[PDB]
Design goal:
Radius of gyration of chain B: 14 Å
Number of helices of chain B: 1
Strand content of chain B: over 45%
Helix content of chain A: under 10%
Oligomer: heterodimer
Bound molecules: a molecule of 2 linked components (NAG-NAG)
Structural class of chain A: mainly beta
Strand order of the largest sheet of chain A: 1-3-9-4-2
Helix content of chain B: under 10%
CATH class of chain B: Mainly Beta
Number of domains of chain B: 1
Chain lengths: 184, 132
């Protein structure tokens, strides 16, 4: 086939989802060019698992799921099979048998704001770890102690989402990164 | 997680040479992205050189023309060859790696590969001391 995959809608979306509420778009029966998806910007990364990046090109008879969201720079390592930490534990989890690619790039120029961008959040607390590709958008007060919270923030009773608050002056590990996860 | 066992540091006079090596675990080594970092006392860690799974290499400006990063995929070994050493090359040097048992391709841009953001595994560090 010779009809272009609409990856431009994923990679070049004006705004990205918070990682805890991550987006998913299905891409099917079209052709693409991995060298167009990844442009090798200085502060960017491209990794594949169980596949060659060339397998992104011929999608004429294949379905790809494009998941996308924003994290901070020092969390990009968690967007991989086998990883631990707040993002992989509580926000976006890949299976051990993940077969696909991860593209992440610094978006300080789009997603920071002099006073703080509070539109991007991540889940800081959860009673247990997500399963692969699970998605949780609940905002129930997290009970960190023995006293039950009754929907009221308080001592040992935490609102579960933390805002990144991205500011363009943040250090290298704290700046925002857009992420596209391509899975087969 | 990748085990990194590192070796070869030492003392040498200015203008001399020294070679670091790093032995890595795993069965997907040729897919790894690999880097060398260094940290002198009372100054923060700095990316020195990187090589991605395709074999493209990147160098900090201060070592271009003197240091060479290379890899031997058949032996799971990473090297840093250091020539024309200067006193300000004195530092503790670390190999870093991004691996994983299903990792099949691994790269990034210049700034990313020379930062710690790329790597989830670090070697134990070896000392290089350049006497004037
Ligand atoms: C996202 O948008 C950028 C910018 O429009 C696209 O990159 C450009 O692609 C054209 C060719 O279509 C080139 O002439 C430009 O030089 C590119 N600009 C760059 C690389 O900064 C990019 O391809 C889009 N991404 C996707 C996935 O569609």
């Amino acid at each position: 086939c010779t009809n272009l995959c609409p990856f431009g809608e994923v990679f070049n979306a004006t705004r990205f989802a918070s990682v805890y509420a991550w987006n998913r778009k299905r891409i099917s029966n079209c052709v693409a060019d991995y060298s167009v998806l990844y442009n090798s910007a200085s502060f960017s990364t491209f990794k594949c698992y169980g596949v060659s990046p060339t397998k992104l090109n011929d999608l004429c008879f294949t379905n790809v799921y494009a998941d996308s969201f924003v994290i901070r720079g020092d969390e990009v390592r968690q967007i991989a099979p086998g990883q631990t930490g707040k993002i992989a534990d509580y926000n976006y989890k890949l299976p051990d048998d993940f077969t696909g690619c991860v593209i992440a790039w610094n978006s300080n120029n789009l997603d920071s704001k002099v006073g703080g961008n509070y539109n991007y959040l991540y889940r800081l607390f959860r009673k247990s770890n997500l399963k692969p590709f699970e998605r949780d958008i609940s905002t129930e007060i997290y009970q960190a102690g023995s006293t039950p919270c009754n929907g009221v923030e308080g001592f040992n009773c935490y609102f579960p989402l933390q805002s990144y608050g991205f500011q363009p002056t943040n250090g290298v590990g704290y700046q925002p990164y857009r992420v596209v996860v391509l899975s087969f | 997680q990748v085990q990194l066992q590192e070796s070869g540091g030492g003392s040498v006079q200015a203008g001399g040479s020294l070679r670091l090596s790093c032995a890595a675990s795993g069965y997907t080594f040729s897919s790894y992205c690999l880097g060398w970092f260094r940290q002198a006392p009372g100054k923060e860690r700095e990316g020195v050189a990187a090589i991605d799974s395709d074999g493209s290499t990147s160098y900090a400006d201060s070592v271009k023309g003197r240091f060479t990063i290379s890899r031997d995929n058949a032996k799971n070994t990473l090297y840093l060859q250091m020539n024309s050493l200067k006193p300000e090359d004195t530092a503790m040097y670390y190999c870093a790696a991004e691996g994983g048992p299903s990792l099949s391709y691994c790269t990034g841009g210049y700034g990313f590969l020379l930062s710690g953001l790329m790597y989830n595994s670090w070697g134990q560090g070896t000392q290089v001391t350049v006497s004037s």
